[PDB]
Design an enzyme around this catalytic site. Sequence first.
Site, PDB file in Angstrom:
ATOM      1  N   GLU A  73       0.864  -1.168   0.000  1.00 17.00           N
ATOM      2  CA  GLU A  73       0.000   0.000   0.000  1.00 17.00           C
ATOM      3  C   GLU A  73       0.913   1.235   0.000  1.00 17.00           C
ATOM      4  OE1 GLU A  73      -1.390  -0.062   4.217  1.00 17.00           O
ATOM      5  OE2 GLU A  73      -2.301   1.841   3.714  1.00 17.00           O
ATOM      6  N   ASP A 119      13.913  -4.153  12.867  1.00 18.48           N
ATOM      7  CA  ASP A 119      14.640  -2.997  12.361  1.00 18.48           C
ATOM      8  C   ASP A 119      13.796  -1.723  12.316  1.00 18.48           C
ATOM      9  OD1 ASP A 119      16.895  -1.708  11.508  1.00 18.48           O
ATOM     10  OD2 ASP A 119      16.519  -2.103   9.369  1.00 18.48           O
TER      11      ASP A 119
HETATM   12  O1  LIG Z   1       6.565   0.284   2.746  1.00 22.52           O
HETATM   13  C1  LIG Z   1       6.312   0.731   1.414  1.00 22.52           C
HETATM   14  C2  LIG Z   1       6.004   2.185   1.341  1.00 22.52           C
HETATM   15  C3  LIG Z   1       4.749   2.798   1.154  1.00 22.52           C
HETATM   16  N1  LIG Z   1       4.823   4.131   1.075  1.00 22.52           N
HETATM   17  N2  LIG Z   1       6.156   4.406   1.255  1.00 22.52           N
HETATM   18  C4  LIG Z   1       6.762   5.688   1.292  1.00 22.52           C
HETATM   19  N3  LIG Z   1       5.929   6.773   1.123  1.00 22.52           N
HETATM   20  C5  LIG Z   1       6.157   8.153   1.469  1.00 22.52           C
HETATM   21  C6  LIG Z   1       6.651   8.945   0.304  1.00 22.52           C
HETATM   22  C7  LIG Z   1       7.985   9.329   0.169  1.00 22.52           C
HETATM   23  C8  LIG Z   1       8.394  10.056  -0.938  1.00 22.52           C
HETATM   24  C9  LIG Z   1       7.430  10.422  -1.875  1.00 22.52           C
HETATM   25  N4  LIG Z   1       6.124  10.083  -1.774  1.00 22.52           N
HETATM   26  C10 LIG Z   1       5.771   9.342  -0.694  1.00 22.52           C
HETATM   27  C11 LIG Z   1       8.095   5.752   1.482  1.00 22.52           C
HETATM   28  C12 LIG Z   1       8.821   4.468   1.664  1.00 22.52           C
HETATM   29  C13 LIG Z   1      10.294   4.585   1.918  1.00 22.52           C
HETATM   30  C14 LIG Z   1      11.119   3.516   1.560  1.00 22.52           C
HETATM   31  C15 LIG Z   1      12.503   3.590   1.796  1.00 22.52           C
HETATM   32  C16 LIG Z   1      13.056   4.727   2.394  1.00 22.52           C
HETATM   33  C17 LIG Z   1      12.233   5.802   2.754  1.00 22.52           C
HETATM   34  C18 LIG Z   1      10.849   5.731   2.517  1.00 22.52           C
HETATM   35  N5  LIG Z   1       8.258   3.278   1.635  1.00 22.52           N
HETATM   36  C19 LIG Z   1       6.895   3.253   1.427  1.00 22.52           C
END
Ligand SMILES: OCc1cnn2c(NCc3cccnc3)cc(-c3ccccc3)nc12
Length: 290
Positions: A73, A119
Amino acid sequence: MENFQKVEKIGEGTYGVVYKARNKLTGEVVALKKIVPSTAIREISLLKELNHPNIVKLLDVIHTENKLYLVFEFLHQDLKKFMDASALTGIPLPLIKSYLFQLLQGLAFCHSHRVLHRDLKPQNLLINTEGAIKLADFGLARAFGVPVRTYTHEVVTLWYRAPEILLGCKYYSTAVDIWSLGCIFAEMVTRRALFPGDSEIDQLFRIFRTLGTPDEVVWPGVTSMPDYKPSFPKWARQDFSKVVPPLDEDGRSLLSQMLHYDPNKRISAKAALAHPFFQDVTKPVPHLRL
Ligand SMILES: OCc1cnn2c(NCc3cccnc3)cc(-c3ccccc3)nc12
């Protein structure tokens, strides 16, 4: 993969790049993680059933050409970003309280299914405009293991790692997630990382300098642990009043319990939900700029 259209990179995970993507069919907007041993497949697959409002939903698992994609999601922001953005004024206590309460519910759920996160860190805590916060990457550590560096070679943060893991405990418990969340709770309150260690020994000593060097008194069995050394410096414990000002006594009381050295004594998520700190918990709406 042909079913998804990558919209933008939303972050680099421990296991791979995470993309915001659109399902070419439903038009559904999701987060796509590009991560295989059969053991990993079974473990991950079971995660599809571990569903809770405060756990980022795992929609599908796609294993192709010996590649593994996890469809989750999508949420609009992560807690690390949100905290940076609120640095000037800090996150209002009622919102911090609501986030903690919801995270504890998510942990209580996972732990009741004997699934650990292992983590937890601000980057894997995602929020929406409705005042919800959810845990991301639950179960991935057991499925793929936690590395010292990410696929991009970025250092895997140690800041939130429980002392038993640092001391070499091979069979750590759900208590490790309570420790991490306690560190996160402190960080939301003070606007500064509680124990920002830059090596395993620095992380350990940062903990010791604040909570006191652990001994058999506070943690029976500690001196026996694999990485424990009798030569560790013996530091005295600081008052939580200095550690998380200006958190009230109920908050400090709960934090102190979440950070108990002995994992057996450390408060469980379920018990934490009943703590007096949450007597007046509400669900405020954060101000998000998407
Ligand atoms: O779990 C899935 C996941 C679902 N949403 N998401 C987001 N969303 C927030 C976002 C961020 C940037 C632009 N638009 C939306 C960031 C990360 C993430 C993964 C790795 C490192 C940092 C954030 N993982 C996820």
